[PDB]
Design a protein around this ligand. Sequence first.
Ligand SMILES: NC(=O)C1=CN([C@@H]2O[C@H](COP(=O)(O)OP(=O)(O)OC[C@H]3O[C@@H](n4cnc5c(N)ncnc54)[C@H](OP(=O)(O)O)[C@@H]3O)[C@@H](O)[C@H]2O)C=CC1
Ligand SMILES: NC(=O)C1=CN([C@@H]2O[C@H](COP(=O)(O)OP(=O)(O)OC[C@H]3O[C@@H](n4cnc5c(N)ncnc54)[C@H](OP(=O)(O)O)[C@@H]3O)[C@@H](O)[C@H]2O)C=CC1
Ligand SMILES: O=CN(O)CCCP(=O)(O)O
Ligand SMILES: [Mn+2]
Ligand SMILES: [Mn+2]
Lengths: 379, 379
Amino acid sequence: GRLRVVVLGSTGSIGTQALQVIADNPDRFEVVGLAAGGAHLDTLLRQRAQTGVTNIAVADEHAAQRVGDIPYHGSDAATRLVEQTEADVVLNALVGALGLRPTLAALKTGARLALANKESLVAGGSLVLRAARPGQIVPVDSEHSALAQCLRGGTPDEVAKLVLTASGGPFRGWSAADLEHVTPEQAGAHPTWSMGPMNTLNSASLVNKGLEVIETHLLFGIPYDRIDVVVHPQSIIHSMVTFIDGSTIAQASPPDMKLPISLALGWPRRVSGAAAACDFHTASSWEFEPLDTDVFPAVELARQAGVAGGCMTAVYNAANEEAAAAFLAGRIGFPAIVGIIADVLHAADQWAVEPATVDDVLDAQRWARERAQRAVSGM
Amino acid sequence: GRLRVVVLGSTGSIGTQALQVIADNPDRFEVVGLAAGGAHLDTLLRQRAQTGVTNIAVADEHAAQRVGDIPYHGSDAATRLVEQTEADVVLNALVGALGLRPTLAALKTGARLALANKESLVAGGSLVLRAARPGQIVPVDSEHSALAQCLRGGTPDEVAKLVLTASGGPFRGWSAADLEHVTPEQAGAHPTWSMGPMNTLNSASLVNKGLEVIETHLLFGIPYDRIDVVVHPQSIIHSMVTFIDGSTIAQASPPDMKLPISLALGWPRRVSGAAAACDFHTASSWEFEPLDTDVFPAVELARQAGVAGGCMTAVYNAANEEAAAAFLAGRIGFPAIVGIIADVLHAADQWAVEPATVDDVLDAQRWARERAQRAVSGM
Ligand SMILES: NC(=O)C1=CN([C@@H]2O[C@H](COP(=O)(O)OP(=O)(O)OC[C@H]3O[C@@H](n4cnc5c(N)ncnc54)[C@H](OP(=O)(O)O)[C@@H]3O)[C@@H](O)[C@H]2O)C=CC1
Ligand SMILES: NC(=O)C1=CN([C@@H]2O[C@H](COP(=O)(O)OP(=O)(O)OC[C@H]3O[C@@H](n4cnc5c(N)ncnc54)[C@H](OP(=O)(O)O)[C@@H]3O)[C@@H](O)[C@H]2O)C=CC1
Ligand SMILES: O=CN(O)CCCP(=O)(O)O
Ligand SMILES: [Mn+2]
Ligand SMILES: [Mn+2]
């Protein structure tokens, strides 16, 4: 039958790509809700006009003032839309802290949650896991989607290791000395129209990989010492699972987020024609190499944060946001991003307690931000 | 509740590796029958002593006499061993189309057929299929083991293509002129697998891969035009499945037949520690290139034979067996192997008829062997 889909973050990269998959597959999906921030209000309004969906939410009141016929506006607008809309699937493609409450609300409705919002898991952690039922959360990102597919190759008891691939970023194979003089531009901080500067930087710093390692633990219930990372420059193999017999199962496709998006939406059913497959008519190679964890310790730090548990991963992420921004403003050098994360985490043991509420997570993030600010400024 | 396993061809490459898996896993497996040709009595006698199994078949009458007290001897020994031994699994690791009757007898008992002896299924065609219940034939071949694992990545209707990898053999990259000079000693080399001299030859000539394409169609019911072959010199990726959404699922491990053996014996349950896993703590690459079908047409000829159906696959194999014997004896050049197969196949119009009995298959092979000898005489 047709799945009713709520798209949260309809004006961003994931959201718009999802809407294309849905437009291409009217047999499999129908949009029944759209939520956006308001920065791209004009796009949301064009989306209302194109899709015919009037069930929309805008967070920013100022932006909402420009329209006068938005059913959900102001803070918690997305959350209210989720609470009040009958749906089969909620795609949470919201950015940052504010994806958390809608994740919780969507889980309570009993819909499947196609999750892109990293903060829901990296920050929300045990709040989100205690609220979600088995199979309810389906990951949107390429590595997690790949692991979900590869896990089909055996029972849960047969898994030995999860292996995330990592592009390695622009500084793949760079020495510590090389990294000393990395500039914001080199770190891929261009005013690229769709993605924010943080995504390319997190990729370059290997912090994104650490975040993905944390999310892997929470999604698939695999201990951190069994979650590995290999550097794979082509990004054709999106991740792999190694089983107890020594067999490894791997997922491969030319880069294209429409594949994992389509699969998250239709899970467990694949969407015909979603993306192009690997073509073996011209010679190619898939290369693998280890990550030098002395030069790139962000993944080791993520495992430490993850193992400590509670709000420690919220701390890891919030420290990064602050240090990364400080790097982009020229307040610190590149190697000092992960240096500050380590300094903040080392000081953060009070946050190992499990959060009872969203406010607990926010307090952990507040603490981590100001602690990172002190480290940056020298105060 | 150990599985009771009869091991046909115990003294060969697959047989010995299989006994090693069983020896390491006495909780899961027990040997209850051994069959061999009689050429390696030292090995067989050691196997009798180490397993404690006296329920033994020896094909060669004189060799069986030399041992004394062999319960089954003569060319029907292996077949009669299968018929009269209660077992849960029959591992058929005989070589050549002579494994046909043991294969048919094994299926008739209701036991799982762990099939290394691809030739018996290639020769038997729909006759073997009609004797099998669904999933009764479980492949030991590394490619088909990989395919079975990767097919867990979706439903049947989601399968777009099956992709077999091929090492490309010792003469990968060689021109037709280069092949003219190939010696039996050069064809006895293999870059990635340690095997008997016949399977090694078949690998060098690509006839092995042709046999495996036919085996794929017969095992999995996928049409020949959706079975691709890609050359992968590392033999780390063992085969892949491409799904309708563009996703490809691949199986990978360092070349070690103990992996597919262990899984075939214990299907669906994996066998802990059966083989070493891919090691991502050191650099490596997985390379792919197209097969050069002009220089190596054996796979195309297999597709032709397979599409024709009936007893045509038996003809393909039998012609190879005769031609291969003549190459190893120094009577014909290396290119003549596949030239003879082409000559025989294209004279075989009458053998497209579906086999009703074993005798139909035997008739087809008898003709093919004579026709192959005619081709050899003409050179
Ligand atoms: N792009 C990718 O491939 C990857 C995605 N992810 C993560 O998935 C999430 C979504 O991906 P992406 O589309 O690129 O993120 P985007 O930044 O491109 O889009 C974010 C969406 O959230 C909306 N939004 C912002 N603030 C609010 C608010 N207060 N209430 C409701 N909605 C709000 C935005 O609306 P408006 O535009 O009007 O502000 C926008 O539609 C991201 O957080 C990203 O980190 C993870 C790995 C990689
Ligand atoms: N070797 C490998 O790695 C791989 C093999 N395979 C397949 O597995 C099958 C077995 O191959 P492999 O183990 O390499 O071959 P081998 O030649 O190593 O072994 C052949 C076995 O069959 C026995 N045998 C020979 N003739 C007869 C006969 N007339 N009656 C009864 N037994 C006989 C031999 O006994 P003896 O010599 O003692 O008389 C020996 O035990 C082949 O069909 C091959 O295609 C597939 C994947 C890879
Ligand atoms: O199952 C494994 N084999 O048959 C050995 C494959 C060697 P090849 O790809 O060169 O035919
Ligand atoms: Mn990713
Ligand atoms: Mn094989």
